């Protein structure tokens, strides 16, 4: 929306902006700021993911042994 640009005259306020922009999408959580798609260490929302776009973001030596596993869904592919 155009009303989100606070310091701009009352007649550039209706409607929305539109159109392509060239920057990684960011998220502002309070005073901080981060790229949406940047897992890294910090984060503004929780993550239970190990991989993210190929990088392996687990602590090295991750190798949990699995002897019992609840199953809730079954895919086929």
């Amino acid at each position: 929306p155009r009303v989100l640009d606070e310091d701009a005259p009352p007649e550039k306020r209706a409607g929305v902006h539109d159109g392509h922009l060239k920057r990684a999408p960011k998220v502002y959580c309070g005073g901080d700021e981060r790229d949406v798609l940047r897992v890294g260490s910090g984060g503004f929302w929780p993550r239970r993911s190990r991989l993210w776009g190929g990088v392996d973001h687990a602590p090295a030596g991750f190798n949990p042994t699995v002897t019992v596993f609840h199953v809730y869904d079954i895919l086929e592919n």
Binding site: R50, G54, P64, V66, V71
Partner: protein, 77 residues
Amino acid sequence: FVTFGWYRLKPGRNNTLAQPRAPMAFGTSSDVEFNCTADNLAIEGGMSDLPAYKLMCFDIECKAGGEDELAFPVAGH
């Protein structure tokens, strides 16, 4: 076997085991992944309880940004 319940990896037909996939060969967004066949699996009855699974409960709010901002939002617009 059941579609919703605890399971267990077994020794298997001859001794064949669950073959833990390598973090790159993951098909899903999961932490650990395995390659079994139906004989490496056991139902593990006796457990009932439900694991630590997460529930998201979301709700979107939408604005209509056309000439008539009292119209109801439409996704195509």
